[PDB]
Amino acid sequence: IAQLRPGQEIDLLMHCVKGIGKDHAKFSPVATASYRLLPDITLLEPVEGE
Amino acid sequence: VLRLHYANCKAYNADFDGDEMNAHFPQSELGRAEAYVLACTDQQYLVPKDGQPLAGLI
Amino acid sequence: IVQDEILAHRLGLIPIHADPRLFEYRNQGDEEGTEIDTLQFRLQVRCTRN
Amino acid sequence: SRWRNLPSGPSLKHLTDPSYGIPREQQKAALQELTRAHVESFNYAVHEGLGLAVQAIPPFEFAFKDERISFTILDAVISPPTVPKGTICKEANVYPAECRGRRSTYRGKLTADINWAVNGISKGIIKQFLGYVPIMVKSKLCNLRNLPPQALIEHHEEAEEMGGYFIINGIEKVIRMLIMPRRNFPIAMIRPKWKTRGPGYTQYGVSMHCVREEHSAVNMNLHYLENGTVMLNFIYRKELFFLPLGFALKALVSFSDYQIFQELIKGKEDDSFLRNSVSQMLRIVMEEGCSTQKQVLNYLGECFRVKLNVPDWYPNEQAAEFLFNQCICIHLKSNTEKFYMLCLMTRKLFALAKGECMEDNPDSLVNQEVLTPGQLFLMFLKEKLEGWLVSIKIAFDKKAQKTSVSMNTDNLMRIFTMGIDLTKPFEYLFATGNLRSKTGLGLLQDSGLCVVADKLNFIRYLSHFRCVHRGADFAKMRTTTVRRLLPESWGFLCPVHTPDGEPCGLMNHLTAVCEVVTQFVYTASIPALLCNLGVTPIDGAPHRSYSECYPVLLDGVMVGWVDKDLAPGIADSLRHFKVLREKRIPPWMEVVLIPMTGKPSLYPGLFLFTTPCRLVRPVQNLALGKEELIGTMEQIFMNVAIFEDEVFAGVTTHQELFPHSLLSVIANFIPFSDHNQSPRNMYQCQMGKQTMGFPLLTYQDRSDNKLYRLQTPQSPLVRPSMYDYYDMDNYPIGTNAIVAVISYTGYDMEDAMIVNKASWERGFAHGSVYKSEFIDLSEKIKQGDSSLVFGIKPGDPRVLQKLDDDGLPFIGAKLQYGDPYYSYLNLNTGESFVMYYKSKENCVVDNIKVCSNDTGSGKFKCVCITMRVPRNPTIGDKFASRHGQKGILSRLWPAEDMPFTESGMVPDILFNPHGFPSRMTIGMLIESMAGKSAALHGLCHDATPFIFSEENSALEYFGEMLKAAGYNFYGTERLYSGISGLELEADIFIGVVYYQRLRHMVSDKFQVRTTGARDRVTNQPIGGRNVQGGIRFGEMERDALLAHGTSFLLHDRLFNCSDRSVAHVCVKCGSLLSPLLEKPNRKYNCTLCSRSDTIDTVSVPYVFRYFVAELAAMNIKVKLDVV
Amino acid sequence: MIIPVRCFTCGKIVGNKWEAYLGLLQAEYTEGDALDALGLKRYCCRRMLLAHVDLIEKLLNYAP
Amino acid sequence: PMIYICGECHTENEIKSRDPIRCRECGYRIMYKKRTKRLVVFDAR
DNA sequence: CTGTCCTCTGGC
DNA sequence: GCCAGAGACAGCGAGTCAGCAA
């Protein structure tokens, strides 16, 4: 959160409320949730010999 | 920021790279009639230099 | 050394393990909050030479 | 050397090193050599040059009563800054950390010991205190000299600072190298406005700029008149005086008129117009009355005595010597050498007139040199010391003219009577920048001499100590020829780094390898060595014909006539001495040999410059491999390959150190500048100096005005290796962003850019501004009782809980417009004044410095409050890449509407692909791939210009890097549409590029006025943004608005909004001035005709009534017809 | 100044891999192997640590 | 009890009306006000 | 730094 | 009175934001 040196002090109260990742990213619950279509690969000819 | 359509760009030569622009507010009700009828931005489709169109997509 | 607004920002982006389904949304202008809609945490730290 | 240990490719394992924060044992040494010309010049100006300056200083003799008194200044000494008098305690030294906290000048004490005598047998040495002269930061007369980085951190300093600046009121003036013509070298010029100087003058003439020991400069012009005669123009105290040559030559030398003649016809002894015109110079004006050196000196003395202001008891022959010593050829001590130099400048005007030589362009760097901070400082110091002498003895002569015998009792009380002078004059030249001098110092410019050095970034700051200004007068010129970027500034000035508006071509910057000469040497064994080499002294026996011989010059002094078949070998021998450091040839002497053919090429001859203000640059001397240094004029007669395999056998005398030597320090920070078009590298250089970055490490101490800070800077993953030589990661400037080049939104067109909203909410490019306001409360009062103490009368309802009992906000409190901001207390009366916060922006107080009076005796009158203003990227803020692609932020696109890639990623910058086709910044498309490959492989690639050829391409290299990571060669990954959810048909070009955030925000450039203040002379809006202020309509707008036929929009704008009054007129007299009110039925009555039934009100502008009034002032009448 | 808490592009939390990153680099591991051993797969996260400049260690050196 | 920290000594000096603004234990002429415990509210956005 | 005035001046 | 010599003389894009010193 921070770094301190002798004589330095932090003192605070944080309030946590409910919300959706739409009005601020901090409230978003997933790193990423993407999707991808399944690739399809077809060998039209028998590949061989290096 | 004052948001403006891109068809009105070539008319002003605005380029959205930091392009301050002024906006005046008529206060007479007789300059509003002329802003509506004469100075409107669709009576300004053709440049008065050679009559060729000014507004267009880009 | 970390500012107050920057500390508040950094604290907003820290994920809390409370499940949001047991809570509720704070009504508009509910500054106080209650057991129903808020969780409070405290950071109080001071650095000293050992 | 000094360019070894230059990194071969950049690294990233220096950050993430176990020793990142430990302050180092010695300072960097590459950053130090940037401000080296500013510091090594001052070091001379203040210690070794000050003695020489005071040594000239002719003893100021004058008459008191029936007595003649002589005052000479034996020594002058400037002391490091220190607590004023001993009235202070516990530390005599004074470190620049303060005077930035307080707002004061870092000034040292200048004191000299004068010696006054009465006829030379009665004498006493008094030591007067002249005044205070400002001091540079690491300048030998400063308290931060010889301090390692660790000890430089306990005094609040940058641990990496190179001062080279002055602190005048805590503002860090940065006096910058101006361009001067040259020193001690005759430049033949063809200027057509010269024939207006007299009846028969021509447009030909050789100018010489003479400097003696860096304390004196003078400009002398030899003009050609149509008769074949040459005139001499000298300037004394800003007045131009014309002396025929011959008067000057006969005075300087006690030689026959045939020997003077045999000298001016040395190389052209067959020409007969010349032989005839030399005689018309010697006889026509000198056999007319004066034929012995003394009679010439006597005649010259009488004509010039009045304007040289010489002593009345001086023989005229002594007043002539005064003119020659102070106005012609300052550089040369002898009068015999001054003769030979005036003779070579004439021998040259005769060749320019007969078209045997080419005019020297004054705008080529070949014939240019720089004016350093020490030359301006000493040249002002010397002039002010002379002025101090003059003023003290003005006071002397004016007080009583009374029996000095007992008056030796108040001699010190007399000298101190005018020793009260030298301090404020000096601060004007530094605080204001403009020069108030009786002689302009042989300068040609009297403003913009010193400028504010602003630390917006460390790339704005480092460019103030490498700037070179052609002149401030050239900003006003129809013709643009001093803005041409000639090919002679190769390696000395950067092609790309020039301001790109009104200052273009006029404000240049030195390349990274270029450097100013600042050392001073003996140069006394050189004239005796040149003779061993083959030169024949000016005295005689050239061994050839004076036409097959080169005229040798060495710093204004003509050694003379090296033979024509010995000049090449002599030049090569002298160049080998300087390279191998043999003899005593300074490592930086410029051995120039301008060959002579039959063509009208530049005047032939072997010059040898060693003066302290020329620009030099290193080049690998082939055939010796010993890293020579060449100058601007010496570089035109030698071949310098850039890459190897460009070196040939006979050609390629030298070779350049690195291929990017030509580019400036900032232009070496642009990645792949070779693949972008040039007008875009000129905008990148100007945009890297307006970037919000990390400006410095010492907050709580600076007390500047504005200070923009970026929260979490990163270091570019793709950066030139020079970025790592001058560690520029101590001060980062931007952030790496995942940019996709896609047309997706409709809001990113025409130069506008899109920013993901979740990236912006996760801290992307957040920033702040520090507004430090110095409240000195000696204002609101004059020299009365202390109305000034910060303080709160107990219980004031106004400051109930916003202040903290010393009339100062709490540290950490938030301030808003209308909030209490300070509370003074007039101690005698006992009344407080809350002084509310009026800025319409929210901030937080982060520190408050209470400052004293410099004697530790101040009384709570001055404070410095620092407010913090959060400036995060809004819509309307300008972003930019490192390639001149600036654009505003038009949208913050939701993070779920952004096109996601097949890897789950989602760009955070959307950049329209239409800025490439017309701007041709192909370096951005390579930086994207290089940065993506870097982020993928954990590497750090270099973007040094000229490292990737046609055979080895950059796209091939980085596409192979990408294809080695599982991505595709061409850098395109295929995205999905975050709005429809379908894989777009085109595969998009995505990558990682380094964005900077510019300092121009809509929050600082937005205005709305309804009604408010008014100019009281015209009664129109005031016209500013800090004041409410109206926007000007303009004549172009008035002429474009009545092409619409809208006369009532014009009436509204120009009449009902700006100024509209009801001034009433007398209808019969038709005059606006005539109606006058009465003494209270208040009837305006016309004064001219006493009727009150004739007055009628008219609606008229207010500037029209002002116009009628100012016309009446001239007796003109405006009679207007009312209907 | 200090490590960002969450990666700007995908809000993956990288504010707890700073000391671990520094520790794997002191052990002899390349920046690539190090960023792999921390779980930073996509290059948007890898740039967040690879190009971080810790200036909180240089500000935390001037007097209190 | 208004405290001010010195510029380089770091000694707590309490200054008032009518008295000079030098620092004890040294003589410097710049002194920074101190942060007291007062409550301020910030938003985490 | 350019082009007309444009008011002499001066010579013829 | 005919027309060079000049030698004054006047003109030189639009808007905008700051800071600093007097």
Add this chain to the structure above:
RNA sequence: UGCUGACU
């Protein structure tokens, strides 16, 4: 008002 920076 001035002057030194800067924006289109």
